[model samples]
Target chain A: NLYFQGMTETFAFQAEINQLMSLIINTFYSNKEIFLRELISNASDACDKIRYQSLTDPSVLGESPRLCIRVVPDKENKTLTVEDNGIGMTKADLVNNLGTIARSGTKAFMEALEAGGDMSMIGQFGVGFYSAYLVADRVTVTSKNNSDESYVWESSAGGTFTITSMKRGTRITLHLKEDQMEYLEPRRLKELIKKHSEFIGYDIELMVE
Target chain B: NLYFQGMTETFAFQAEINQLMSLIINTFYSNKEIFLRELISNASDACDKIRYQSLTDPSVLGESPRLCIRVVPDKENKTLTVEDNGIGMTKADLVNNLGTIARSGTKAFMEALEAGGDMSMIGQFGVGFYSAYLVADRVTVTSKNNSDESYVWESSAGGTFTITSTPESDMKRGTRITLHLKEDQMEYLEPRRLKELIKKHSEFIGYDIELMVE
Candidate 1:
């Protein structure tokens, strides 16, 4: 993790993660704990995608087909990470899917929100990844597809994300805000995971050293 | 209560509470309970505001000066309302504050909640009102400021709110928010359930909150 402290070759996002955090912090602040729930849900979806792909294309799963998600909480750096080795994403996928609101009708999503609607409507319309903003000021995602090209996407709150090249599976790192330091505690992270995603059908390893 | 049902001049809201019900039902399907907590918190805020205001404007205290919030749950109508007679909103205040997020970042004292973090921040940033969407499909806020003229602000999820011309004869002194519950949300209708929510969330609310199950 320390080796990639400073990576080269990054691209800034076009839209930005601005009002998005403002939205989460206020609208759904009471439910902040679910940031973990949304992340784990996406990881599970990614792994499931690869496993299904394996049925048709046996070569996609590679040597290690076992699906696992790891949550690492770092106190010194004030960051928490949820990483997985699943059906990694491509550059275009990063832009179109991860870059944009990921899903469609963010048009419908924000209107429903401004109209004072539901958070779940986001999943029904937009992507669940943005919930990370509820806890972190910045999020860094690094992943490698089977094509063996690894890329890194990094962004701070109210800013665009930059995708530098990387070399592994999907790893998301959340740089906690000064006020959100509590999320870096392994004990609290463990409790939040159990409380929210206890039945999530995957082996979730808490990396607390 | 039935008499007010057909207020001759009242409007049925330009926006259908239609989209709102669908929003809560689909998006926050599981977390339907927080709606109570959000309302009580605001009711407490209204109480706190007048308490602070009375410090400078002694005349504004009025004769009663008694601050109390009433939570009337109508099982027959399938609705719940929280009404507080604190620093009520006048016409101008309603268009700005009520139309927006209510008050400033809770300058009100919530030393306990600030320690808790999230709830306090919601009030600080002005997004607390929308939590009503967690339960009700439509939210109607009726308020009266110092002058005593009452106004109604109505909206469903994803629709613009409309303010109907309100008559002064029959309105409360503060704010009353009525939430029409979905059929599956009957569990919240029980008196014990309301009592527990009142105790769990707003018990320490600086004033009186009567869980009136009429």
Candidate 2:
């Protein structure tokens, strides 16, 4: 037990999750490719945050300022993990920002997402991460805040989520739905990332193993 | 009903408000001017999000794509208003992002804050609207989302805030924040100083930030 320890807590999504989740999938699921765009944009934003902090205090990026989002595929587990070492999340943060959907806007986006509605029109992070549900059977987020111990958050999109303390920084794993397994291909995954996020500031790497 | 129609809702700051607020004021705030940097950066982010969306849909812009931040100094009212024609907030956004401090990090920032014992070392908006408390006695945020009616969020850092619907013809659809300055905080009313801060912190921002003295 060198440094890994914390309790697991169960939490429920706010009331609107069912309606909002349905709306998001129905809207972005068609384009499916957008899910990668949202995640990469968010990762880039996180990296920018840490890069800014590094300006005044160089030590914050103790490891290095070379921030990148890494994608690791586990076909056995049928999962795709996207992670960033940018400013991570604390227990409270995991609960506030990630634990809840809008802790940052599925509601208004849902109401506005009908005919002629486009995915890019939504506000920051509004249609993001939630899109993981579009291609995955379940989602797991493990983030280590710079201040607090790392924690694991997982959900099946059944209206509730759980948090378990773990390692450091943030790593989001998507358990691909059976039909979505084509994304498990490194070549295919790289193409998608290149297509949508090649222009992103941070480098996105994929691990073949 | 007249322009003012939505029901009012009362909200409270999260638990760490006292400890963290005290810590923030005691520290970094000595410079005091970084508050403007935080607000402008947030406005810029809102603008970027809308611009990203506007790429696909033009109607969301309501007016024009001239996304910029306006610093209006009202000497008569003793306030500095930072207005943006970005994606405005719906009542939910005003509540989620503004009403709650960490909706965004007093948590990690507090620990990392004291450990490092420095101010300028955090990410954008990590210092956030709460910093408004540093230069102003009271703050009011009036935002209009193109998809929803307009609403007003006002508070004095008393740990509680009130939100109500209101009318403002000027802002087609964006966030307008009014900072009620303490007489001592009057130095923020100068255009040169505003220009300096705007350039120092966010000159690279995509939009043109105009300094207007009223």
Candidate 3:
């Protein structure tokens, strides 16, 4: 029989980093418009990563001819899925990388933020993923990397999360809370995505019905 | 006289550098505090040059005990002198470095400016020295380096200058730039103006500065 001991740890924060994070969430991202901007920025980064890789290895181009992002709201499930066909994540990548919040390289993100660069510039900071937790009580990320099997990472904001193996690409579903019901509306989500990412060089679709 | 006959040359500018100069003088220096800020900034660069050299040779620090900036205004002469006790210029250095703005690498200056770096961070811009031209018709620079004898550079903003070896006198080991203000710029000769400008632009400067006016 294997014996296992479980421990829960509280994270400590640098005073300034904590202050700045509060300022960003409270002051900068106070406007809901910035949420859509963040997602579009992530999509653009995924596309750029694939495009750069395709330059060296031609075969990786495979069947995915054009890169794109699609935001679809599942009103019946009360979930909003932000899907991207760019580089996906494997089971281990999902478990180790996506399961924890602070493990996300937040220091570099804060530095970029301090440099007055565009906030939309995806931060290595873990704060970005936590932003989803702000609008939803529960979130699920399903991703598949080229190297391994697909996996789903499920989390409720606090700290720990669950990871399960699945299939390819990334599908992020935000389980909108009662107050976040507006995000479950297909037309509203589509409008938000279009407004922020019309020029992002990706086909973004909002699934209705 | 060694002279080469050359045709009178006229060049067209995409945009007048002088217009940018005026804008810088008017808008950038609108704070009026940046004048002293700029002078102190130049002084600090001189000190940094000496400090950088001293890294390889420790004796350079022994040559000058203090690095400081002194601003003295002569009301009777309508002249303001900003002096620095750091790496002074030689005769050739003055003529080559300060005598001609065109000779100074301007392309690097433009690149640095475009990169959003502080204009003051650029040591060889020469355009900032021309800020003296905005207020003064005549400017004089006296410098003495450990490697070379003291020399004086005098100019009247007419694109021409005179360089002469300094007569033996009691002088510090550094550079002193004197600006002879025009009638309109005489306000810059005031002690209050000098103090205000120094406090605003150069409060963060690493050295001590004294503005003397009578």
Candidate 4:
């Protein structure tokens, strides 16, 4: 066994490999570029969540009340990151939100799809989060909610993830696969953000560093 | 029971009001004008279905292999018709396809919507057919397939429908959907409005869409 670090815990995913999830991932094959859009959408939502919460409890926003999403690409490290100063998740939120796939209505969605029914809401829930796997072999998320301690969540799309003590908001770093290194380019990220997320609610900056 | 002649048949709807259907109907409130687009989309699908089937079974196309969608608005009758010389449906198809609400994926659709997920295929599945109810108090669909005799499917969205055999080649094959427009839906009975709608939503449909006007 590997030596343990302070306040670090590892747990298996709640459920392994759902059929609809596999189908959705397969469906996304042709539209792989949407992975960035999906990530940014989630990031925007996270910001929106904090903004909404700030309406009631202004303290939840903390010092990072000025919400923003940053797309940071590190060519040296071969990593592409999407960071947001929004409603960052605590360790429990990370475990619950990310550890499960299609937690609600997935079965119903499949049945409805089979029967030729309306399909929506594919972007909400944890369904879109997995789009990160389309490009990355490993994903690292550092998040800190106002209510709980900071935690670093790491996963490789395997059945388990490790979390350790981390930010006031969430920063997701995707260790881009060899073929996906194109995402590490500032030009591509800027073009993609302009094409799909030009009208996004949050201010998404393509950071030079 | 009312008396009927020939091969006419009347049956109650397969199921009653679905929450998702109701939600969808309400959701369509702001986009009531898209009713024409939805119908045109369905008509294009029917035409596409027949076109594809003709590749395998040419006989199913009958003499009217020339596919087209015609928008006929009769102001005198207060009705708007979108007819397609495509793969028409049989009486059984009407009972199953039209007589049901959100037959598939509706419950799941709502749950996914509630949970927040991807939404597509809203225009597919008989879901869009109900958009006819947006502008029409009653809808009558007369369809004939090469495999079966002609039949008229009638419904007022009152949870029941009556089917009667009458007969058509444009009288022989294909489907004619006539919406008895509500009093307030007079704009739909105008050719100018329908032409604009056709241009906006269905300009790319392969089949020739002719708007019959004075």
Q: Better model by DockQ, 2 or 3? A: 2
Candidate 4 local lDDT, A1-209, one digit each (tens): 01112344556565433354345534535456677887889899889999998898898877677889999999899999899988889766876767643366556556665786533344643466667777777889898888898888887755566766645788889898787788977788889999988678788899997
For residues B96-164, write the lDDT of model 1, one tens digit per residue: 554433243333323323364443244444446666766676778888777757777766654345454
Clashing pairs in 3: A106-A125, A150-A166
What is every candidate's C-alpha DockQ against the true complex, given to 2 decimals? 0.01, 0.01, 0.00, 0.00
lDDT winner between candidates 3 and 4: 4
**A179, model 1: CA deviation in Å?**
1.4
Shift of residue A190 alpha carbon in model 3, Å? 99
TM-score of model 4 (CA atoms): 0.45
- Give each model a TM-score: 0.45, 0.47, 0.40, 0.45
Please give me the total number of clashing residue pairs in predicted model 4. 15
Q: Worst 10-residue stretch by lDDT in candidate 2 chain A?
A: A1-10
* Cα lDDT tens digits for candidate 2, A32-129: 65666776777887788888988999888876568889888898999888899888888777666664545336666665565455666553635577
Model 4, stretches more than 4 Å misplaced? Answer: A1-209, B1-7, B16-28, B100-102, B108-121, B124-126, B167-170
Can you tell me which runs of candidate 1 are displaced by over 4 Å? A1-22, A25-28, A100-102, A166-168, B1-214
Which candidate should be chosen as best, given TM-score against the real structure? 2
Tell me the tens digit of each residue's lDDT in model 1 across A68-178.
899998888888899888888877677556654434454566677778876754556555687787777788888888875777777675445555544336888999867
**Candidates' lDDT values, in order?**
0.67, 0.73, 0.63, 0.73
lDDT of 2 at B56: 95
lDDT-wise, the better of 1 and 2 is 2
